[PDB]
Enzyme design. Structure first.
Site, short mmCIF file in Angstrom:
data_model
loop_
_atom_site.label_atom_id
_atom_site.label_comp_id
_atom_site.label_asym_id
_atom_site.label_seq_id
_atom_site.Cartn_x
_atom_site.Cartn_y
_atom_site.Cartn_z
N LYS A 1 0.93 -1.18 0.01
CA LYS A 1 0.15 0.16 -0.21
C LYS A 1 1.02 1.18 -0.14
O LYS A 1 0.55 2.34 -0.67
CB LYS A 1 -1.16 -0.12 1.24
N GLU B 1 -1.87 6.42 14.98
CA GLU B 1 -0.90 5.28 14.62
C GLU B 1 -0.06 5.03 15.61
O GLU B 1 -0.36 5.33 16.92
CB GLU B 1 -0.17 5.84 13.35
N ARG B 2 0.96 4.16 15.18
CA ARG B 2 2.04 3.70 16.22
C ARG B 2 3.31 4.99 16.01
O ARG B 2 3.58 5.19 14.83
CB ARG B 2 2.64 2.36 15.98
#
Ligand code: ATP
Lengths: 160, 510, 51, 466, 51, 71
Positions: free
Chosen positions: D162, D188-189
């Protein structure tokens, strides 16, 4: 006792009243009103009354109607509101109206009470204790003060 | 005699002397005290939530500011006292020592060495709750563990920064299993934490018995909160850990924690909320658990040097704040419909279902695999552990797949029979005890059955357990190189020769 | 593990002897810091007669 | 900022919560949206009025927390909410979720303090029209058609490239498509977001889209905020005619986000307490995204799976927000082909039978027949010895080897990643070259010849290489 | 077994802090006399001086 | 509610006796989101749809005595 309804009251008191200068004038009228509810038969008879019209009626009527017309037609206003149930709320809030307007004061610590109106801190305060004279603090004089510093001290006796 | 001088010392201390002050309150009137919920007046606007040290020390933290209206609380015995008593105000909530000193130190939940330890090893003062480290302030540490089951690692290895849910079973050990965990941890002698509320003094006691039994017992510390720990305090401990937990994470050391009975913090917030007469989420507790476990759940920070200020700021300490989170997931039936179990479930960086079935029919390790799903996984399984770790879900399929054959009475095939040989027989392989350590030199022990002929070799569960233990003998016989192995912890065929000839020793080891 | 206990007990017992011994000094420094924190004036005439 | 010159307001009446129990300059009330920017202790406070309620006493809320202050206050009223520097200058430059210079000052290009409120067009305005879309992905834009200026439901698990294919989107939406290619994310992380800055270097093309991120610990308003300012952005790109196409992170974050929203209201929320109008917010949403007059207002539709909900009023809405259905194959990733994902479940809705008519009703619909062809040729013919299966079923297995290998094709992504160049592909060379070839023509084309090889000149001229 | 006596130290000395605690308890009584003995409304005028 | 005025209770000092504002237009009393407590419009007709300022005939169905809520 909500006093918030009576806040809108004392609002309209300095406001329309002091506007009418009834803040003093219906400080008088108001005084006579708290005298009216102060009547305990007038408390004993306070509310059985469905028609609040009957209430302002027998109220101004009974008591002698020292209320203003601002307080007679206002007597329709709060009486009709039935918020008239609580007299003193906006009475001390009107005391807070003119008084808060005028506010200068004091509080005696480690002393018998002071309450010397001080527009500024230490203004009439240090002027009072300095002005003491009194200097005795009698109520809270010694055991209270000496137990104040010694209160912190026993707080050190926390060491045991 | 001996301590008399201390009096002088105290006198020395008390030498600081005293004064009266604060002529104008500086204090309130605690209007209507009801069970420590005081309608309260005086000294109104302030730091919201200020813990106001009332009679005794009681520092009433009430963040509820109505316009003009006070009511307040702090954990403790409000029953005898009366309303109106002028509000004795400490300025705010407090901080208990902030330092890494504790090691395995013991205390009340306040840090009060309710052990009678008297011990304070931490610096200064630590207020409780905090957020996670930023990008590359937290950055993945892969630091693995094989936790006392070989399968412990095998299913899902991990590293610092991680939080994985493990569903749990009442009266199954899933506290005692949950207990059975710490084997490698006390063995780890590495930085971790744990928390408990409403605790049971027996479990406390015997627990401690295990603590000494646990070799370390100091490798990490926990304060303690019992059946009277305030629903407040219940909510508090999760906040609490970060306090000096920094002195690892900020130290750039791995911080690591364990929180359990979180429900206690929840319905803590419930009898709070209903007590608050405040409409809460379902189960009478407010939905803050999102934020409550947003703020709460955030912290885990894998070692990363945009913790560049962590500890010394950064006197480097420019360095990698590691914070590994230890979840505790359990419910009656393990109900996820809990909005807590719902959203909370979402936040989980791993989710392990524990099966009451194995230890139910008794199989000591009980847990529910693949119903157990953790995202960290055998990435932390080192090259061999990385290497050999594959076939798991296979028999989870295969064995269970083999299981399906029974569904038609007498449906089986010799091939499938081999899928119960690997599936069911290799199923017979695995076990983890009521108390199981895991060697991870046992990693080899694992890689045998395929790697060695141990798939076939000593195929009898009699010879699997027996003759395999007799291969543990063959270690007694020959376990010279395992030094270099657990040293290594990685896939090298050079070893694998020693794996075959090992299997020869297994012939010798039967 | 059994034995050491009894000794430890004796130690505490001596702590009791020296404890009562210390009672004296506690009366002493007791009045002493009494005058110190009196911090107003010290009349040692009044005998608290603390043990 | 707007006004909020004058500090306005007054006290915060009952100090509880970010929503205002607050005395404003009691006569003063703005539009509930119309912001009120105070000083928050040190910080300058701000609340868009959560409630419009009189006496300067109305809920006015923020993503932060209130402990410590006095009920007393005064709060300047930012006459505008929503107006924040916005435009296309942000592209590549890191915006906070505030748009703030997220990075070392990420300095997403300061632009019109621009109302977030950009929204639906007239029937004709953004296209009373239909605008189809493809960027020529090697085996893919050929595989599925698309409609320009929009979003389509994305279902696939893992190993997408992706980010790779995003580089193909750099190689497309930035390159093989001009229209301004923007994107944003949230929740997100941390260092893995920083690792999406690493990837931001992998594509390196990050300059097309300002960096603006949520980091899910962001509070519910914080979590749910960024979008409409995103419309102050497509208020450049699509509005800038350089068609706004911006990649869309997180539905579960958004679905659950609106849940936490209407929850906080304490209101009768949507069912299960969700945001009641979150769907109506989808009407405003697709209402925003259209191949426009201005420029195609387009969005990459991929959902933080609202638990990947079953029947998923989200997927229910995301169906019909999917012009093309989607699947990604770990199996074609197990096939590992340069086509590594699931063509199964991935195609445009109306492409084959009509709307290409035969063009896809032949090439693509008949191609789907071929999906049956290696489907039961590979599958059925795999069941036992395929000797029974006509070699067509084994030339449906050269549809597999040969043709499906041709599907494996270099990628404009793989250029931007592995160097495997890839292209904006020509489905003619599919509709013919791969349709005729994959079917009957040059069936001698090796898998390998076709494998990892682009359109039938790369697969079949790689069959000249064989 | 050794750790036992260790606790006999923590507790022994701890009790030393106890008899400490009672010690300046009775001391605190002596200071009650220190208000009783040698207090002055002059010193009260020194607090009045603290005005 | 009623006490809110204090200005029309300042009135009502007289204007509980003083009176007579009945009109098709008394103030929208409370504005939140097209729901306004509202004044005047004494007897108003069926859900009487009241052509709103820069806005449609606004309807209030069952007469809310004090301040009619509006749509
Ligand atoms: N791995 C294990 N195998 C077999 N038995 C175990 C294991 N772990 C714990 N147990 C058993 O569980 C018993 C204690 O039950 P315990 O209350 O801990 O159950 P529980 O699962 O912890 O319930 P909860 O998790 O709700 O506390 C002990 O007798 C212990 O032998």
């Amino acid at each position: 006792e909500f006093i918030t309804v009576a806040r809108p009251y004392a609002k309209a008191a300095f406001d329309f009243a002091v506007e009418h200068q009834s803040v003093e004038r219906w400080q008088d009228m108001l005084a006579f009103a708290a005298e009216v509810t102060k009547n305990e038969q007038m408390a004993e008879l306070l509310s059985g009354a469905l028609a609040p019209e009957t209430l302002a009626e027998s109220f101004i009527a009974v008591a002698g109607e020292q209320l203003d017309e601002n307080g007679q037609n206002l007597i329709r206003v709060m009486a009709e509101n039935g918020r008239l149930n609580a007299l003193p709320d906006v009475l001390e809030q009107f005391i807070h109206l003119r008084a808060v307007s005028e506010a200068t004061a004091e509080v005696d610590v480690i002393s018998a009470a002071a309450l010397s109106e001080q527009q500024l801190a230490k203004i009439s305060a240090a002027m009072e204790k300095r002005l003491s004279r009194k200097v005795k603090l009698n109520a809270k004089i010694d055991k209270s003060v000496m137990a104040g510093v010694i209160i912190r001290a026993g707080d050190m006796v926390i060491d045991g | 005699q001996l301590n008399s001088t201390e009096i002088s010392e105290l006198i020395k201390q008390r030498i600081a002397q005293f004064n009266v002050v604060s002529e104008a309150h500086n204090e309130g009137t605690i209007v209507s005290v009801s069970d420590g919920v005081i309608r309260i007046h005086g000294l109104a606007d302030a730091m919201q939530g200020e813990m106001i040290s009332l009679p005794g020390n009681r520092y009433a933290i009430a963040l509820n500011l109505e316009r003009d209206s006070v009511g307040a609380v702090v954990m403790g015995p409000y029953a005898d006292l009366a309303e109106g008593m002028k509000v004795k105000a400490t300025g705010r909530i407090l901080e208990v020592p902030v330092g890494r000193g504790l090691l395995g130190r013991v205390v009340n939940t306040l840090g009060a060495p309710i052990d009678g330890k008297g011990p304070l090893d931490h610096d200064g003062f630590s207020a409780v709750e905090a957020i996670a480290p930023g990008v590359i302030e937290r950055q993945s540490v892969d630091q693995p563990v094989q936790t006392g089951y070989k399968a412990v690692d095998s299913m899902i290895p991990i590293g610092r920064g991680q939080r994985e849910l493990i569903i749990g079973d009442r009266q199954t050990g899933k506290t005692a299993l949950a207990i059975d965990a710490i084997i490698n941890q006390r063995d780890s002698g590495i930085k971790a934490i744990y928390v408990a509320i409403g605790q049971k003094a027996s479990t406390i006691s015997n627990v401690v018995r295990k603590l000494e039994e646990h070799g370390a017992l100091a490798n990490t510390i926990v304060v303690v909160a019992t059946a009277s720990e305030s629903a407040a305090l219940q909510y508090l401990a999760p906040y609490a850990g970060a306090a000096m937990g920094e002195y690892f994470r900020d130290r750039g050391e791995d911080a690591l924690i364990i929180y359990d009975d979180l429900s206690k913090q929840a319905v803590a917030y419930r009898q709070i909320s209903l007590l608050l007469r405040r409409p809460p989420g379902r189960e009478a507790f407010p939905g803050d658990v999102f934020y409550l476990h947003s703020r709460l759940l955030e912290r885990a920070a894998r070692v990363n040097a945009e913790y560049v200020e962590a500890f010394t700021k950064g006197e480097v300490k420019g360095k990698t704040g590691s914070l590994t989170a230890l979840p505790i997931i359990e419910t009656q039936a393990g109900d996820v419909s809990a909005f807590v179990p719902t959203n909370v479930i979402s936040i989980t960086d791993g989710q392990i279902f524990l099966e009451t079935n194995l230890f139910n029919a008794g199989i000591r390790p009980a847990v529910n695999p693949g119903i157990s799903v953790s995202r960290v996984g055998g990435a932390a399984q080192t090259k061999i552990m990385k290497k050999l770790s594959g076939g798991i879900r296979t028999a989870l399929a295969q064995y269970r797949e083999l299981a399906a054959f029974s569904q038609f009475a007498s449906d089986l095939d010799d091939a499938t029979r081999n899928q119960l040989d690997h599936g069911q027989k290799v199923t017979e392989l695995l076990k983890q005890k009521q108390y199981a350590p895991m060697s991870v030199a046992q990693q080899s022990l694992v890689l045998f059955a395929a790697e060695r002929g141990y798939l076939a070799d000593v195929e009898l569960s009699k010879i699997g357990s027996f003759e395999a233990a007799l291969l543990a003998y063959v270690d007694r016989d020959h376990a010279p190189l395992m030094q270099e192995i657990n040293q290594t912890g990685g896939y090298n065929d050079e070893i694998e020769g020693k794996l075959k000839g090992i299997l020869d020793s297994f012939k010798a080891t039967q | 593990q059994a034995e050491i206990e009894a000794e430890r007990k004796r130690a505490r017992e001596e702590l009791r002897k020296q404890v009562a011994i210390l009672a004296v000094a506690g009366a002493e420094k007791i009045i002493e810091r009494s005058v110190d924190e009196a911090a107003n004036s010290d009349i040692v005439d009044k005998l608290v007669a603390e043990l | 900022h707007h006004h909020h010159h004058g500090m306005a307001t007054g006290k915060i009446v009952q100090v509880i919560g970010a929503v205002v129990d607050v005395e404003f300059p009691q006569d003063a009330v703005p539009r509930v949206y119309d912001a009120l920017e105070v000083q928050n202790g040190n910080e300058r406070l701000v609340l868009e009025v959560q409630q419009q309620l009189g006496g300067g006493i109305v809920r006015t809320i923020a993503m932060g927390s209130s402990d410590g202050l006095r009920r007393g206050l005064d709060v300047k009223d930012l006459e505008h909410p929503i107006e924040v520097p916005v435009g296309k200058a942000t592209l590549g430059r890191i915006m906070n979720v505030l748009g703030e210079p997220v990075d070392m000052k990420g300095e997403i290009g300061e632009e019109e303090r621009w109302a977030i409120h950009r929204a639906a067009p007239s029937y004709e305005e953004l296209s009373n029209s239909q605008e189809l879309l493809e960027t020529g992905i090697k085996v893919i834009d050929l595989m599925a058609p698309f409609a320009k200026g929009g979003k389509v439901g994305l279902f696939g698990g893992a190993g997408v490239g992706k980010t790779v294919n995003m580089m193909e989107l750099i190689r497309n939406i930035a390159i093989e498509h001009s229209g301004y290619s923007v994107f944003a994310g949230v929740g997100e992380r941390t260092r893995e977001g920083n690792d999406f800055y690493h990837e931001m270097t992998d594509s390196n093309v990050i300059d097309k889209v300002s960096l603006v991120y949520g980091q899910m610990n962001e509070p519910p308003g914080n979590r749910l905020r960024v979008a409409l300012t995103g419309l102050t952005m497509a208020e450049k790109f699509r509005d800038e005619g350089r068609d706004v196409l911006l990649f869309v992170d997180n539905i579960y974050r958004y679905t659950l986000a609106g849940t936490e929203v209407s929850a906080l209201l304490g209101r009768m929320p949507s069912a299960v307490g969700y945001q009641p109008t979150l769907a109506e917010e989808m009407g405003v949403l697709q209402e925003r995204i259209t191949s426009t007059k201005t420029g195609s207002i387009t969005s990459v539709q991929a959902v933080y799976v609202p638990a990947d909900d079953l029947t998923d009023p989200s997927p229910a809405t995301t169906f019909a927000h999917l012009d093309a259905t989607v699947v990604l194959s770990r199996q074609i990733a197990s096939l590992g082909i340069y086509p590594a994902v699931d063509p199964l479940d991935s195609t445009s809705r109306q492409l084959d039978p009509l709307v290409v008519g035969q063009e896809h009703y032949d090439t693509a619909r008949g191609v789907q027949s071929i999906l049956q062809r290696y489907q039961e040729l590979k599958d059925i013919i795999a069941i036992l010895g395929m000797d029974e299966l006509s070699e067509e079923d084994k030339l449906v297995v050269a549809r597999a080897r040969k043709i499906q290998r041709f599907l494996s094709q270099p990628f404009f992504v793989a250029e931007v990643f592995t160097g495997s160049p890839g292209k904006y592909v020509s489905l003619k060379d599919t509709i013919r070259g791969f349709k005729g070839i994959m079917e009957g023509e040059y069936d001698h084309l090796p898998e390998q010849a076709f494998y990892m090889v682009g359109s039938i000149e790369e697969a079949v001229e790689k069959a000249k290489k064989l």
